[PDB]
Design a binder for this molecule. Structure first.
Ligand SMILES: CC[C@@](C)(O)C(=O)CC(=O)c1c(C)cc2c(c1O)C(=O)c1c(O)cccc1C2=O
Length: 154
């Protein structure tokens, strides 16, 4: 979990359909948190989610107001989805992000309950500074990645 986030590409197979991956994203990605042991130091409270291109997702913190932590690029039918991230250095929103980067993600349905995803983030270091700190909100422990925590619960 280095302060700098260089371009890295990782892929993994999980038990889920591509439609499910997004159905859950706009339905309750924060709720994945189990009743025991909290993966996030902060208690997630709510999240706003809307489907579209140049889209936006929001998270509510019990002590933190509602904020947008990401963006989208375009939705490609059950097969590929690209997305841009819209967040500030201190989890704040702004009319435009000068340190915004683009991410390419591919979703393909495997079996009735199999999902293969290829997520590649690039030039994210553009935000540098507390860049991983922003990720700290998403919380991606080395021992377990987002694919692990969300796939296991699904
Ligand atoms: C230790 C955290 C870290 C760096 O592993 C992480 O958080 C990876 C992350 O950007 C990420 C990646 C690489 C892939 C996926 C995802 C990741 O965010 C991911 O969230 C995901 C998902 O929510 C539902 C289906 C598939 C996926 C993914 O394939």
């Amino acid at each position: 979990m280095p302060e700098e986030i260089p371009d890295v590409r990782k892929s993994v197979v999980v038990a889920a359909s591509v439609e499910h991956c997004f159905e859950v994203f706009t339905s309750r990605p924060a709720d994945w948190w189990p009743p025991s042991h909290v993966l996030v130091k902060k208690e997630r409270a709510g999240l706003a989610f809307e489907p579209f291109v140049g889209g936006r997702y929001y998270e509510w913190d019990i002590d933190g107001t509602e904020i947008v932590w990401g963006r989208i690029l375009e939705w490609d039918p059950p097969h590929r989805l690209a997305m841009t991230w819209r967040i500030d250095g201190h989890w704040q929103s702004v009319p435009d992000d000068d340190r915004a980067s683009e991410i390419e993600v591919d979703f393909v349905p495997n079996g009735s309950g199999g999902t293969r995803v290829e997520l590649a983030h690039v030039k994210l270091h553009r935000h540098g500074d507390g860049a991983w700190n922003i990720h700290k909100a998403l919380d991606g422990p080395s021992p377990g990645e987002t694919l692990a925590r969300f796939a296991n619960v699904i």
